[PDB]
C-alpha cells in the first residue's frame, strides 16, 4: 500500500509522531542538565529511548511510501517516490536525526543523554503535524492557545534546566543566586531541584522579578540574557495570544456586524421611534436565530464550482420540494443556486403589492406567507414552504390582463426567508430547460382564470 | 476684529492656547496645594495673584472671544453681533463656561475650575489642523496624560501619608528630603507596576496599594496602548510600502523571475515611492469626493494640458474633460513607451523627464528629443480607421512621468465636439 498525504491515515501518523518527538525535546535536556534524574530511572529511560528510535525508523519507511502529486495525479509507484525523497533535504536531515550514536555510546559512558542530541533534527515533523491538525480541527482558537501554551512551558523548562546546569558548574551554596547547598533538608530531594529551578525560571521570564541578587560576573551575564529574552521573546508569545482573543473579537464582530453603526446613525437622525424599533426588533432576531447577515462573502472564498455544490446541500430540502426543480439531469440546480439571492421579511411587510411591477421569483425557503386581497380583509390562500408565487409577472402570458402589474398582494404572516431571482436571470433558466417553460405556462394561466 | 472665524484665526488659536495654559495651571496646581503643605501665609499672595490672572483670562474668554465667533446655519455664515451673542448663549459651551466660572482659604474651593475642557479639545483640534507633522503633538499629549496621572498618584500618596502618622510605618512617607520627588518615585513604581516597595502593614495601607495596583494595571496599559496606536499610525505609510515591496519580492523570488527584471521592479518601486510619496494614488482619489478630486486634477494639470501644441484654445470644456480622463504611471529609463509595429491605443503627455523619438537606418538615432509639456503618439490614434501603426519607436532618456489618455475616452470626448475634432485631425494630418 501507498499512503496519501491528503488521506486520513497519513494524518493519524503525524499525530502519532509528535509523542516520541516531545519526549525527545523535553526529557533529553532535562537528563543532561540533571545528573540525579539520569541515574535514578536508568531502566525506565532505556525502554522509552528504544521506542523513540524505533518510531523514528518507522517514519523513514512511511516517507518512502507517501505519494507525491504530479500533474494533479497521485503517484503510487514506489521507485519514483524514492528518487524524489533522496533528492530532498528532509532525507538528509532524517538520516542525521537517527544517525547511530551507539558506536560512541559505550566509550563516553554507560549511557549519555548528550550523545542523543541528534534526535532534535526531527522537529520539522512536529511542526507539520501542528499545521495539519489546525486546518481540520473543530475548534481552531482552542488549538492556537494550546499550541502557544506548549511553547511557553518548553521555553521555561529549557531555561530552568540551564539555571541548574550553571549552578552545578559554579557550585551549590556559593551565594544567594545559585542553587542552595544540598545539606539543607528541603533541597536534598530531586523533586525540589526541578520545582525550584522552574520557580526561578518563571519569575524571570514572566517579568515578575523577586529574585536573589547576582554576586559573580558569570551570574550577571546569565541574568542579562534572561531579562533580554523575557522582554521580547516572551512578549511575542503573549502578543500572539492577544491576537487569538482579537480573532474571537472579529468572529463576534462577524455576528450581527455593524449593529452599533446602525444605532448611531439612527439616534443622530432621530427620524422616528417606531421605525427605530422595527430596525432593532429585526436586528435582535438575527442574534437569536443566529443567521449570518451575508453568506455570499463567505462563499466568495470558495471557488465558483465548489460554491454551487456547498449551497446545494444547505438548501437541498427547499430545492427538492419545488415542483419546477430537477426537471432532468439534475443540472439546472447548479445554475440557480448561484444566481439566487437570500432575503428576510418582517411580518406585515408585503413582499410585492398589487399594481406594482415585481422582478423577483420569490421561492419560499422557510416561513408561511398568505396571499391576500387588495383590501386585506380576506386571504386567498397561505403558502407553507417550498412554493412559488408572483411568477406570472415575469413570464409573458397570452391574454394576460395587466401583465407587468401584480394581480395579488402577498403579506408575510410571520418571520420568513425568501430567495429572489431577477427576471432577466429567469429567462436564462427557462432558455436552458423547455420543461420549466411549460410548468410556468400551465400554472400561470390557471390562477389567471380564477 | 469684530468677527472671529474659528477655523482660520491664528489669534483665536493663540487665545485658545492661553486658555489651555490657565486650565493646565489650575488642574495641575489644585492637587499640589490640596495635598502638600506648599501653601504658606507668605506664598499665599503669589498663589492669589496667579489665581486672579487665571480667573481674569477665564472671564475675558467668555466676555469677548466666545461672544465674537462667526457661525454657519443653513449654509449661511452670519456676522451679525446680536445673532453671534444669541448663538453663543444657545450652546453647551456657554453652559460649561458658566458652570466653571461659578464662584462657589481652601485650595479645593477652586475645584470647578477644571470643568473647562471644551477649550482644551478645540485648541487640540485647531493646532492639529494647522500644524504639520502633528503626530509628534499626539505623542506629547498622550505622554502628558500619563505624567498627569503620575502627578495625581504622587499627591494622593502624600495625602494618605498625611492622614496617617508621618513615619509611623514603613509604607507611610517618612518625610526627609523633597516631598514631591519621593512621592513621584512611589507613583512611578506602583503605576508602571515595577514593584519593590516596602510591604503595607495596616489595613488602610493594604486597601490603598490594592486599588492603586488595580487602577494602575488597567489605566497604564491603556495609556501605553494609545502611545503604540499613535506611533503605528505615524509609521503606517512606510509599513504599507514595505509590506507591498516585501510581498512583491517574495512572489518574484518564489517564481524565479530573472534578476534583471527583479532589479527593474525594485528600482521602479523605490523611485515612485520617493517621488510620489504614495503608491496607487487612485484609491485616495476615489475616497475623496468627485468634485474635490476633479478640482484637484484641474489645479495640478491645467498648465500642462493647456500648454500643448495639438489642442491650444480649441475647447475649454474639452480641456476639463481630458483633465478628468488623464492618468499617470512612471516609465523606467531606456524602456520603450511605444514600438513602430504595435498598434497605437494610447496618447501620451510628458509631465516630467525626457523621451527620445527613435528613427533612422536600423533605428538607433534620435530625430527629436521631446521635453516636458509635450504630446506624442497622435498619429496612430487619429488616422483613417485607426489601423495605422506607430510611425517611430519612443524611449525614455531617463525616469519620466507620462499622462495617459485612453483611445476610447478620447473618442468619447471627440463625438461630443466634432468641430474641435476636425481641427485636431487636421493638425494630425499636417504632421505626416
Amino acid at each position: 500500500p501507498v499512503l496519501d498525504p491528503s488521506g486520513d491515515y497519513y494524518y493519524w501518523w503525524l499525530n502519532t509522531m509528535v509523542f516520541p518527538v516531545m519526549y525527545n525535546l523535553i526529557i533529553l535536556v532535562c537528563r543532561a542538565c540533571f545528573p540525579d534524574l539520569q541515574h535514578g530511572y536508568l531502566v525506565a529511560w532505556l525502554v522509552l529511548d528504544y521506542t523513540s528510535d524505533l518510531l523514528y525508523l518507522l517514519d523513514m519507511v512511511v516517507r518512502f511510501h507517501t505519494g507525491f502529486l504530479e500533474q494533479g495525479i497521485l503517484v503510487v509507484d514506489k521507485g519514483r517516490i524514492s528518487s524524489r525523497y533522496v533528492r530532498t533535504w528532509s532525507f538528509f536531515l532524517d538520516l542525521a536525526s537517527l544517525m547511530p550514536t551507539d558506536v560512541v555510546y559505550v566509550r563516553l559512558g554507560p549511557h549519555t543523554p548528550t550523545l542523543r542530541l541528534n534526535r532534535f533534527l526531527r522537529a520539522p515533523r512536529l511542526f507539520e503535524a501542528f499545521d495539519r491538525t489546525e486546518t481540520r480541527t473543530a475548534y481552531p482558537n482552542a488549538f492556537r492557545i494550546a499550541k502557544l501554551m506548549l511553547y511557553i512551558f518548553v521555553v521555561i523548562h529549557w531555561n530552568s534546566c540551564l539555571y541548574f546546569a550553571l549552578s552545578r558548574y559554579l557550585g551549590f551554596g556559593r551565594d544567594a543566586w545559585v542553587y542552595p547547598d544540598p545539606a539543607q533538608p528541603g533541597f536534598e530531594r530531586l523533586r525540589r531541584q526541578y520545582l525550584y529551578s522552574f520557580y526561578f525560571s518563571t519569575l524571570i521570564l514572566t517579568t515578575v522579578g523577586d529574585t536573589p541578587p547576582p554576586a559573580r560576573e558569570e551570574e550577571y551575564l546569565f541574568m542579562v540574557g534572561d531579562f533580554l529574552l523575557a522582554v521580547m521573546g516572551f512578549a511575542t508569545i503573549m502578543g500572539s495570544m492577544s491576537s487569538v482573543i482579537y480573532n474571537m473579537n472579529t468572529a463576534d464582530a462577524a455576528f450581527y456586524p455593524d449593529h452599533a453603526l446602525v444605532k448611531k446613525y439612527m439616534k443622530l437622525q432621530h427620524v422616528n421611534r417606531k421605525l427605530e424599533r422595527r430596525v432593532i426588533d429585526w436586528y435582535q432576531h438575527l442574534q437569536i436565530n443566529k443567521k449570518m447577515t451575508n453568506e455570499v462573502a463567505i462563499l466568495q472564498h470558495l471557488p465558483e464550482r465548489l460554491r454551487a455544490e456547498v449551497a446545494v446541500s444547505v438548501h437541498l430540502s427547499t430545492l427538492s420540494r419545488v415542483q419546477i426543480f430537477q426537471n432532468c439531469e439534475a443540472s439546472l440546480l447548479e445554475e440557480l443556486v448561484l444566481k439566487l439571492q437570500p432575503q428576510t421579511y418582517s411580518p406585515g411587510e408585503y413582499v410585492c403589492r398589487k399594481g406594482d411591477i415585481g422582478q423577483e421569483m420569490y421561492i419560499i425557503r422557510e416561513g408561511q406567507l398568505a396571499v391576500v386581497a387588495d383590501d386585506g380583509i380576506t386571504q386567498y390562500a397561505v403558502l407553507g414552504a417550498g412554493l412559488y408565487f408572483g411568477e406570472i409577472s415575469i413570464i409573458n402570458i397570452k391574454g394576460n390582463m395587466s401583465g407587468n402589474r401584480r394581480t395579488a398582494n402577498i403579506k408575510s404572516l410571520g418571520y420568513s426567508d425568501l430567495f429572489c431571482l431577477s427576471k432577466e436571470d429567469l429567462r436564462e433558466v427557462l432558455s436552458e430547460y423547455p420543461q420549466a417553460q411549460t410548468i410556468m405556462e400551465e400554472k400561470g394561466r390557471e390562477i389567471l382564470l380564477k | 476684529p469684530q468677527s472671529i472665524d474659528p477655523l482660520t484665526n491664528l489669534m483665536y488659536v493663540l487665545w485658545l492656547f492661553f486658555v489651555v495654559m490657565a486650565w493646565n495651571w489650575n488642574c495641575w496646581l489644585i492637587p499640589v496645594r490640596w495635598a502638600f503643605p506648599y501653601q504658606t501665609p507668605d506664598n499665599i499672595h503669589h498663589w492669589l495673584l496667579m489665581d486672579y490672572l487665571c480667573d481674569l483670562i477665564y472671564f475675558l474668554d467668555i466676555t469677548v472671544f466666545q461672544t465674537r465667533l462667526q457661525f454657519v446655519r443653513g449654509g449661511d455664515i452670519i456676522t451679525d453681533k446680536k445673532d453671534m451673542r444669541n448663538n453663543y448663549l444657545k450652546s453647551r459651551r456657554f453652559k460649561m463656561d458658566l458652570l466653571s466660572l461659578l464662584p462657589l482659604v481652601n485650595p479645593l474651593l477652586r475645584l470647578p475650575r477644571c470643568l473647562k475642557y471644551m477649550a482644551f479639545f478645540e485648541f487640540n483640534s485647531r493646532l492639529e489642523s494647522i500644524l504639520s507633522k502633528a503626530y509628534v503633538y499626539r505623542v506629547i499629549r498622550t505622554t502628558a496624560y500619563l505624567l498627569y496621572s503620575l502627578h495625581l498618584n504622587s499627591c494622593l500618596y502624600y495625602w494618605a501619608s498625611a492622614y496617617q502618622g508621618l513615619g509611623s510605618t514603613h509604607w507611610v512617607y517618612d518625610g526627609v528630603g523633597n516631598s514631591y520627588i519621593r512621592c513621584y518615585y512611589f507613583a512611578v513604581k506602583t503605576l508602571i507596576t515595577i514593584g519593590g516597595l516596602p510591604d503595607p502593614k495596616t489595613l488602610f495601607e493594604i486597601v490603598f496599594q490594592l486599588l492603586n495596583y488595580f487602577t494602575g494595571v488597567f489605566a497604564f496599559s491603556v495609556m501605553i496602548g494609545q502611545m503604540r496606536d499613535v506611533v503605528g499610525a505615524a509609521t503606517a505609510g512606510q509599513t504599507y510600502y514595505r509590506s507591498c515591496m516585501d510581498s512583491t519580492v517574495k512572489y518574484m523570488n518564489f517564481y524565479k523571475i530573472p534578476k534583471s527584471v527583479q532589479n527593474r521592479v525594485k528600482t521602479w518601486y523605490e523611485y515612485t515611492w520617493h517621488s510620489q510619496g504614495m503608491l496607487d494614488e487612485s484609491e485616495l482619489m476615489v475616497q475623496l469626493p468627485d468634485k474635490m478630486r476633479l478640482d484637484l486634477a484641474i489645479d495640478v494639470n491645467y498648465n500642462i494640458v493647456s500648454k500643448v501644441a495639438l489642442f491650444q484654445g480649441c475647447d475649454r470644456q474639452m480641456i476639463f474633460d481630458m483633465l478628468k480622463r488623464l492618468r499617470s504611471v512612471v516609465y523606467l529609463p531606456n524602456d520603450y513607451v511605444c514600438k513602430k509595429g504595435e498598434i497605437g491605443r494610447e496618447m501620451y503627455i510628458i509631465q516630467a523627464g525626457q523621451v527620445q523619438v527613435l528613427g533612422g537606418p536600423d533605428g538607433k538615432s534620435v530625430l527629436v528629443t521631446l521635453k516636458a509639456g509635450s504630446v506624442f503618439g497622435e498619429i496612430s490614434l487619429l488616422a483613417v480607421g485607426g489601423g495605422n501603426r506607430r510611425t517611430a519607436n519612443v524611449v525614455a532618456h531617463g525616469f519620466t512621468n507620462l499622462f495617459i489618455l485612453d483611445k476610447k475616452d478620447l473618442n468619447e470626448i471627440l463625438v461630443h465636439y466634432p468641430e474641435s475634432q476636425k481641427l485636431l485631425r487636421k493638425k494630425a494630418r499636417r504632421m505626416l
Partner: protein, 446 residues
C-alpha cells in the same frame, strides 16, 4: 397559562431577575466555605438570601417550560410543544440538578455548591444586554472587569483554603496565625488574601517566597494563568478603547493622506485651504459618515423605507413627486445619492453637458449669469433643477446643455439623481416628462 415571548422586553426583565442569584452564588459560595468567620458572623443574612435565591431558581423552571420558540416563523402557544422542546435538551438535566435538595449539614455552604451549575442564564444576560444597550463598548469593559474580579476573588478563597489545610504560621508563605490579634479579624483576612491574589495574578510580585514543595506548585500555576489574564487585560481593554476611537482615526488618516498629496503635487495654497475647510465643514457637522455604506448590510425593503423617513421633509417639498402622486418615489430615493459642494463652486455652467438632475436639500443656490456676480434667478431648497437639459425636448433652444450657470453662494448640501435612473422611472411612468416639458418650455423664452 401564558407563553413568554423571547423577543419581548418582559423576557429581558426576567433575565435580569435570574442573573443576580447566579452571580450571588458564584461570588459568595466560595467565600462562605473558605472563610469560617464569614459564615458564623452573618448567619442570619445568608439564610434570607439563600431562600430568596432558591425560589428564583425554582421559578426559572416554570418560565423555561413556558418560554416560547419560533417554528416556521410563528411562535407556538401549545403547552405540549413547549414542554417537548425543553424537557429533552441538556439544559433541563443541568437545571434540575441545580435545584435538587441537599437533605440527602444543610446550613453549611459546601453542600450548596450544586447551585453553580446554572451558569447559562448568567452568560445569556450579559450577551443580551450588549445588543440592547446604547453604549456597547463601555458595557463590554464593565463586563470584562466583572469577570476579572471573580477570578481574583476566587483566587483569594483558594489561597486561604490552602493556608487552612497546611496550617497558619508554620511557614512564611501562608497567611499568619489567626490567634494573633493583629491578623484575627475577618476584614484583615479577606483584604490581604484579595491583596495577595491581585499581586500574584497580575504578575506584580512582592509576595512572600514559598517554602514547602506543595506551595511551589501552586505559586507556579498561579503565575502561568496570570499571564493569560494579563493578555486579556492588555488585549480586550486596549482593543475596546481603540475600536471606540476608530471613527475619528479614519478621518484623521484621510486628512494626512491628502496633505501628503498636496506637497507632492505642489498644490497652490488657495486650493489647499479650500480642501481643508471643506473637510473641517464635514467634521464639525458630523456628516462625513455615509448612510449607504452603513445600511448596505441591512436588507433592501427596510433600507429603502428608512431612507424615505430621513429625507421626508425634502421629498414632500418636491413639487414633481407631490403632484404626480405615482409610485416612482420608493425606488428613486434609493437611487438618489448625496453630494456636498463648497461655496464659490459652480454646480452647473452654461455650455456644459448635463448627465444628472440635482435636487437641493439645504443650500442657497443661485442661477448666475456671465461673470457670476449677477444672478439670473434665485434657487431655494426643495426645488429641482437641470431636468430640462437631461430630458431632450424637440421644442428646445438647446439640447443636453445647461441654459444658465448654477453656483453655490454658501456651503450647499444637495442630492444627485443620474439620468439613467430617471430613464428607469420613465419606463414606469411616461406622463411625468410631458408635464415637465410644459414647465420646461416657459423657461426657454424667459
Amino acid at each position: 397559562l401564558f407563553v413568554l415571548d423571547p423577543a419581548g422586553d418582559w423576557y429581558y426583565c426576567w433575565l435580569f431577575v435570574i442573573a443576580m442569584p447566579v452571580l450571588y452564588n458564584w461570588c459568595l459560595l466560595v467565600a462562605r466555605a473558605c472563610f469560617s468567620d464569614l459564615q458564623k458572623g452573618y448567619y442570619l443574612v445568608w439564610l434570607v438570601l439563600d431562600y430568596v435565591s432558591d425560589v428564583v431558581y425554582i421559578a426559572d423552571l416554570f418560565i423555561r417550560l413556558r418560554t416560547g420558540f419560533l417554528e416556521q416563523g410563528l411562535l407556538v402557544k401549545d403547552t405540549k410543544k413547549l414542554r417537548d422542546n425543553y424537557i429533552h435538551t441538556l439544559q433541563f438535566k443541568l437545571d434540575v440538578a441545580s435545584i435538587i435538595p441537599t437533605d440527602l449539614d444543610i446550613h453549611s455552604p459546601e453542600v450548596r455548591f450544586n447551585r453553580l451549575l446554572h451558569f447559562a442564564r448568567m452568560f445569556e444576560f450579559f450577551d443580551r444586554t450588549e445588543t440592547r444597550t446604547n453604549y456597547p463598548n463601555i458595557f463590554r469593559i464593565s463586563n470584562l472587569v466583572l469577570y476579572i474580579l471573580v477570578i481574583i476573588h476566587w483566587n483569594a478563597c483558594i489561597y486561604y483554603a490552602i493556608s487552612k489545610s497546611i496550617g497558619f504560621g508554620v511557614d512564611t508563605w501562608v497567611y499568619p496565625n489567626i490567634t494573633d490579634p493583629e491578623y484575627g479579624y475577618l476584614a484583615r483576612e479577606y483584604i490581604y488574601c484579595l491583596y495577595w491574589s491581585t499581586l500574584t495574578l497580575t504578575t506584580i510580585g512582592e509576595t512572600p517566597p514559598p517554602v514547602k514543595d506543595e506551595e511551589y506548585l501552586f505559586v507556579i500555576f498561579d503565575f502561568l494563568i496570570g499571564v493569560l489574564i494579563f493578555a486579556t487585560i492588555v488585549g480586550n481593554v486596549g482593543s475596546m478603547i481603540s475600536n471606540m476611537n476608530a471613527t475619528r482615526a479614519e478621518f484623521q488618516a484621510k486628512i494626512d493622506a491628502v496633505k501628503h498629496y498636496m506637497q507632492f503635487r505642489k498644490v497652490s495654497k488657495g486650493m489647499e485651504a479650500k480642501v481643508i475647510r471643506w473637510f473641517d465643514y464635514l467634521w464639525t457637522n458630523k456628516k462625513t459618515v455615509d448612510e449607504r455604506e452603513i445600511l448596505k448590510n441591512l436588507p433592501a425593503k427596510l433600507r429603502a423605507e428608512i431612507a424615505i423617513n430621513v429625507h421626508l421633509s425634502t421629498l414632500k417639498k418636491v413639487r414633481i413627486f407631490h403632484d404626480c402622486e405615482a409610485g416612482l418615489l420608493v425606488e428613486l430615493v434609493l437611487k438618489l445619492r448625496p453630494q456636498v459642494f463648497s461655496p464659490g463652486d459652480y454646480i452647473c455652467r452654461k455650455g456644459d453637458i448635463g448627465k444628472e438632475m440635482y435636487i437641493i436639500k439645504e443650500g442657497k443656490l443661485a442661477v448666475v449669469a456671465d461673470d457670476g456676480v449677477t444672478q439670473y434667478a434665485l434657487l431655494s431648497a426643495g426645488s429641482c433643477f437641470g431636468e430640462i437639459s437631461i430630458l431632450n425636448i424637440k421644442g428646445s433652444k438647446m439640447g443636453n446643455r445647461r441654459t444658465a450657470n448654477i453656483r453655490s453662494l454658501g456651503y450647499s448640501d444637495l442630492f444627485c439623481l443620474s439620468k439613467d435612473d430617471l430613464m428607469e422611472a420613465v419606463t414606469e411612468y411616461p406622463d411625468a416628462k410631458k408635464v415637465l416639458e410644459e414647465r420646461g418650455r416657459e423657461i426657454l423664452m424667459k
